[PDB]
């Protein structure tokens, strides 16, 4: 890696940030006001005897969480391309590691994945909170793996922890999506499916792209290559989400 | 590390196994039926416009639970006291690492924590699966800490995250005990409240030892002493729990 | 607040057979778990059957092939069947949860 390479993403990075501001002011400007609730049931005596009716405890407005999931990658991606801040940027991307990426996904993908959840017909807080708590920690597992190791030298333990810490969520979805033991006679909408497929296909091609940049071929020696894949897949996977949920839930008004 | 006192933890493993197995066998014998359900709400319709009344998918039983997570270490107390098996540990605590304790904890602990959140009156399902897959995140991050750093030089970045990756379960027990927006007027049991501040206790002092293991004070230097501590908690752990469900829930037959 | 109101009961002969009803109030019916108690004049209590709100059926032992216990969702319905009685019966029936406890009624049998 020489400079030139190391400058060029400072233009790149720009270009990405304000995609992501001018998507996010359009969502706030367009969208209607809709919200889906978060609930609890609670006991009415001993530990398994009697229960109660359930209630609902808070409300996610949706217009205002896509454009948090937006406004979050914006920020991120003009604080990098600053001053002090490119300075350290390059001296990491010398090292092979990147920090500021998984500080964002952290956040953005918990949001993304806690929004797909909600909107399949799932709405106790428990299962929600410790849906953050699975995303987060896979997303964890890869900064380890990153930090830890080395290319080329067959060492993918990190790796396999944060695949075996990323199916949870997915199972559940799968679990409400064949609904065993209901006694019900509607069947489920198609934009649902469509944002199942299409959000496990993005999350498989990130996992992928990891994987061969940890292998190490005869192409993919080069880090930067890996850099450009992030940015443009997590460039694509935010549009291709917030744009399914406002045509179909949010446009009637 | 000398021969002789690797060669004492054959005799101190299986007093802990033959412990475990006479709990496990008198637990089994003397429990009656008992039983606490998995439950789920699903939709009637659009997304968020109408839902439908709670059915029962699955029903746990108790004893049988009890019996597995006291067997589960029975029997790798007792394979570790075997053969070639023993061969190996040795030789790995030669190396500072331990890998049977973890692969063992990964299932107990999960086991334990599902059950002891069925109890405060947590029954849909996604909620156990995720905190189950937020426990083994938190005991993995801890095998990684402990493969890829040495003590005394400063480094705890894993311990961190493993820290991190394990307090939501206890949030959304807090919440759950704590109970915001119900409408009701019968008060929570007291053995509830032994239980959970006992078992908070015991997982707070865990963390500590693995911390003051990695430290590396002046008479902690030696992993041996580490190893003493974690096989007496476990020890302790698992019969402080599972003779507080069965004196209080499982009894009256 | 949690209603339960039961219905049935009265006289009959050694060989006859009853239907006790019990209907449910302000809870979630199709989770909560349903009991049936008999008190005898002159003793202190007894259990006869629970429905554990799931499929799964207990007995007291003493009633073990005689009587049948069976729950009706979407209605809120506990019923109870009583076949081949037998002169010790003569009893009050209360219909049970987690200690919201029912007026109960009467059951009588002749020789």
């Known amino acids: 890696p020489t400079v030139k390479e190391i400058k060029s993403l400072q233009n790149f990075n720009r270009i990405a940030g304000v995609f992501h501001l001018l998507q996010m002011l359009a969502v706030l400007a367009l969208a209607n006001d809709f919200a889906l609730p978060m609930t609890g049931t609670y006991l009415n005596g001993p530990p398994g005897t009697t229960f109660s009716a359930p209630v609902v405890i808070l409300e996610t407005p949706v217009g205002l969480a896509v454009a948090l999931f937006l406004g979050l990658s914006a920020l991120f991606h003009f604080i990098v391309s600053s001053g002090n801040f490119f300075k350290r940027y390059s001296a990491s991307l010398m090292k092979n590691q990147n920090i500021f990426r998984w500080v964002e996904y952290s956040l953005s993908s918990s949001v993304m994945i806690v929004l797909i959840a909600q909107i399949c017909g799932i709405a106790d807080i428990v299962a929600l909170l410790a849906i953050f708590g699975v995303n987060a920690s896979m997303i964890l597992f890869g900064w380890l793996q990153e930090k830890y190791t080395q290319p080329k030298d067959g060492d993918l333990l990190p790796f396999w922890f944060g695949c075996i810490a990323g199916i949870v969520p997915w199972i559940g979805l799968l679990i409400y999506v064949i609904a065993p033991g209901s006694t019900s006679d509607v069947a489920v909408p198609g934009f649902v499916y469509g944002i199942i497929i299409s959000l496990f296909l993005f999350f498989n091609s990130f996992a992928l792209v990891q994987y061969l940049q940890y292998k190490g071929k005869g192409k993919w020696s080069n880090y930067l290559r890996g850099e450009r894949a992030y940015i443009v897949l997590s460039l694509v996977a935010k549009s291709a989400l917030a744009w399914q949920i406002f045509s179909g839930t949010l446009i009637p008004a | 590390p000398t021969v002789k006192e690797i060669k004492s933890l054959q005799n101190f493993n299986r007093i802990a196994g033959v412990f475990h197995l006479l709990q496990m066998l008198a637990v089994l014998a003397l429990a009656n039926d008992f039983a606490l359900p998995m439950t789920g709400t699903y939709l009637n319709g659009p997304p968020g416009t109408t839902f439908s009344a709670p059915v029962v998918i699955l029903e746990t039983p108790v004893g049988l639970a009890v019996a597995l997570f006291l067997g589960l270490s029975a029997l790798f107390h007792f394979i570790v006291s075997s053969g070639n098996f023993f061969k190996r540990y040795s030789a790995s605590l030669m190396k500072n690492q331990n890998i049977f304790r973890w692969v063992e904890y990964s299932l107990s602990s999960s086991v334990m924590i599902v059950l002891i959140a069925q109890i405060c009156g947590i029954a849909d399902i996604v909620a156990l699966l995720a905190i189950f897959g937020v426990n083994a995140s938190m005991i993995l991050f801890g095998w990684l800490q402990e493969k890829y750093t040495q003590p005394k030089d400063g480094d705890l970045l894993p311990f961190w995250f493993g820290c991190i990756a394990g307090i939501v379960p206890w949030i959304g027990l807090l919440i759950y005990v704590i109970a915001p927006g119900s409408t009701s007027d019968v008060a929570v049991p007291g053995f509830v409240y032994g239980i959970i501040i006992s078992l908070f206790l015991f997982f707070n002092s865990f963390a500590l030892v693995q911390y003051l293991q990695y430290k590396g004070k002046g008479k902690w230097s030696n992993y041996l002493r580490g190893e003493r501590a974690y096989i007496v908690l476990s020890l302790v752990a698992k019969s402080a729990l599972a003779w507080q469900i069965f004196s209080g829930t499982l009894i009256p037959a | 607040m949690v209603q339960l109101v039961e219905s049935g009961g009265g006289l009959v002969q050694a060989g006859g057979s009853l239907r006790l009803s019990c209907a449910a109030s302000?809870?979630?019916?199709?989770?909560?778990?349903m009991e049936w108690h008999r008190q005898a004049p002159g003793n202190e209590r007894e259990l006869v059957a629970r429905?554990?709100?799931?499929?799964?059926?207990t007995y007291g032992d003493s009633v073990k092939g005689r009587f049948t216990i069976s729950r009706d969702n979407a209605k809120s319905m506990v019923y109870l069947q009583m076949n081949s009685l037998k002169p010790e019966d003569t009893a009050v029936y209360y219909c049970?949860?987690?200690?919201?406890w029912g007026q109960g009624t009467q059951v009588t049998v002749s020789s």
């Open positions: 049970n949860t987690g200690y919201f």
């Open positions: 429905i554990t709100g799931g499929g799964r059926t």
């Open positions: 302000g809870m979630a019916f199709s989770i909560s778990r």
